[PDB]
């Protein structure tokens, strides 16, 4: 079935310091929306809690003409993994790996994040981030079981400026895609992240809308 | 007034070889659509004619809730210049400069393109390009008179693969002035080694969710 | 003491397929040279064995005016971790994390590599790589305990062409650097990798020479 | 013959504002060193004078085992053009074009620089730059008449930080022709808002180990 609820476990290190967060949420796979809450298990985070965004489930994402490949993967009892690399404008780098397990309509996500190079006086380490702009991702097919995308992410800072990152994503599926499915590309997805956070807990309310053309 | 017709002059060099094209077209500033035809004045192009895409007028682009800054600029009798840098996946680089002059609803565009580093056996120099994917650009404001954007451009090749370029655009206005502003565009092209025609469609949006 | 011998354990996944290699080698910390041999523990590698290069120990690297920060770290009983991101020209991405432990002059290295987006018909997955060009890395200081570098890596292919990657490195130390040490930058390092490999075993003979100016 | 003296003319625009500088200098083609002085012809520059660095002649550059291709080109009465793209960490972009003419051992250089997207409060527009780090460029060959290079440029700021740019260079020769070839360079600069002087040192190498 399509997902209804999920658990999340984020862990790894940022600038050489380990962090760990656990939580979960729920979503509407018909609307492409979801909510996720994560709480630290090692006390206050040493970096902006917003760095955990957009990391806080494309299994909730439908396409204009039916379930997305991500949803079909879950429905058919298959699976996929997610790999991303964030190249921040000030030298910071963040690499991520997401793995999932399914139990009925409940998803369990294990997310490993490794970040480094964030200036100690930068927006991340000094928690200057206050929001993030809506964003459009571009998805295309690579090989026969991989979807690749790119997006230019931008956080909003207290001073009104923006903090940017060039992002690349690779979604690797355990089962190959059909020939007709691969004819439908690129696929664009507009997403907006509404966040509420503290030094120990972060909550994301994500909205998504995919389109082939406008 | 808003634009209705335009003429174009593209010139410069690709891999050290000069090229020159002239032509024009028209468009619908209420729909964001336009057509442009350019013909070489120096014989057959030595590189893929598709390299002239998307270079073949945002004055035809309306925004989600009214005229775009590009249109407002023209309506008020002001202007802007366009600068882009295309970073191709195989090392090729393309720098462009667009300047305009207006006469009523007619636009005259001068476009200078300087490209280098394209492998002689690559898709550009061996004309492997056959089409280009629809594309979404992300626009934000900088300083008091500049709009900046980025987009990941991708051509479709004869062999079924794609040929990508990371693109940056800077629109500098002559006078000081909701973001980001996204724009979906699709280019429909018909080309030969001496003439290229573009039918462009555009649709801007602030948000879809 | 300075290192004399080392063990290596590389593991992770490339394009969604797990791999694991173990081995080790020795080096000359006075010359900046070293040799490392790694052998697969899961049979033949599904990707070019050269992808394991340059991953196969800056503790062997001296500077023109004395032991490098990497060597001093080991000598003083401290330590550092290494994080890299390889951005390949054809979309491939490789993120790495190296951690070390020391026992006298013997180093134990645990290397985690996560790669994705390599085209199935590309030089990596079809093993077209036959060598790699000499390379110069540029090192500068960030914060008070991090060294950052960049280098433009290039493999040589059978057809005579090259396969490039833009690389970023972050070396995070457990102890902060002195003020005078940080005045000495950038530091450049020329390195050449001499490799011999098979689908199951790879051997690297690395040469290095650092300089502040020429 | 190898070069001994040169004149320079830099022009173009930065963030939509035109600039123009003229001057010249000399160098030692056996040592790879040279000096260049350029003075503004349009009053004080509106951006950091250091932005004119490293733009202020590889004809003075020898290689590890003999004259460089840049020198061979000049000696044989041929020539080459230089195209660079600077991708600055804060969004600024700079595209450059250098063309030369020779008269014996004297070189005349025409340099066009087009820059945009520099934040008005950034290090370039507020003149925060005070120096630049030594730098190593990596050169490789492409096609039959091009040399391509890359280098990670870094300016030093008044506040102690660095301001970086990812740079790509394409040297296109008029006629067809050991790699990579690395070149360490250091720029010693003295500048004011109207005049900039560069003392450049260069040393190429194929390998050091």
Strand percentage of chain A: over 45%
Assign the structural class of chain A, choosing from mainly alpha, mainly beta, alpha/beta, alpha+beta, or little secondary structure. mainly beta
Please state how the strands of the largest beta sheet of chain A are arranged side by side: 1-2-3-14-13-10-11-12-6-7-8
- Helix and strand succession of chain A? EEEEEHEEEEEEEEE
Count of DSSP E strands of chain A?
14
- Rg of chain A is 17 Å
How helix-rich are the residues of chain A, as a percent range? under 10%
Short description:
Four copies of one chain form a homotetramer. The first copy, chain A, has one domain: Beta Barrel (Green Fluorescent Protein), CATH 2.40.155.10.
Give your account of this protein's structure.
Chains A, C: Keywords: Luminescence, Photoprotein. Chains A, C: It holds the Pfam family GFP. Chains A, C: InterPro entries: GFP (IPR009017), GFP-related (IPR011584). 4 copies of one chain form a homotetramer. With 214 residues, chain A is mainly beta. Chain A has a single domain, classed as Green Fluorescent Protein (Beta Barrel). Chain A contains 1 helix and 14 strands, in the order E-E-E-E-E-H-E-E-E-E-E-E-E-E-E. In chain A, the strands form 2 sheets. In chain A, strands 1-2-3-14-13-10-11-12-6-7-8 form an 11-stranded mixed beta barrel. In chain A, strands 4-5 form a two-stranded antiparallel sheet. Chain A is globular. Chains in contact: A-B, A-C, A-D, B-C, B-D, C-D.
């Amino acid at each position: 079935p399509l997902p209804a609820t999920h658990d999340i476990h984020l862990h790894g290190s940022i600038n050489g310091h380990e962090f760990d967060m656990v939580g979960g949420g729920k979503g509407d796979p018909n609307a492409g929306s979801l909510v996720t809450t994560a709480k630290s298990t090692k006390g206050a985070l040493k970096f902006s809690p917003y760095l955990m965004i957009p990391h806080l489930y494309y299994q909730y994402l439908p396409y204009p003409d039916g379930p997305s490949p991500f949803q079909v993967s879950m429905l058919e009892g298959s699976g996929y993994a997610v790999y991303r690399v964030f190249d921040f404008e000030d030298g910071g780098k963040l690499s991520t790996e997401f793995k999932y397990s399914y139990e009925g309509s409940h998803i369990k996500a294990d997310m490993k994040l490794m970040g480094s190079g964030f200036p100690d006086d930068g927006p991340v380490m000094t928690s200057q981030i206050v929001d993030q702009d809506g964003c459009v991702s571009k998805k295309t097919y690579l090989n026969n079981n991989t979807i690749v995308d790119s997006f230019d992410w931008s956080y909003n800072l207290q001073n009104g400026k923006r903090y940017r990152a060039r992002v690349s994503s690779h979604y690797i599926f355990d089962k190959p895609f059909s020939a007709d499915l691969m004819k439908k590309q690129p696929v664009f997805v507009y997403r907006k992240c509404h966040v509420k956070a503290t030094k120990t807990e972060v909550t994301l309310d994500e909205r998504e809308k995919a389109f082939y053309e406008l």
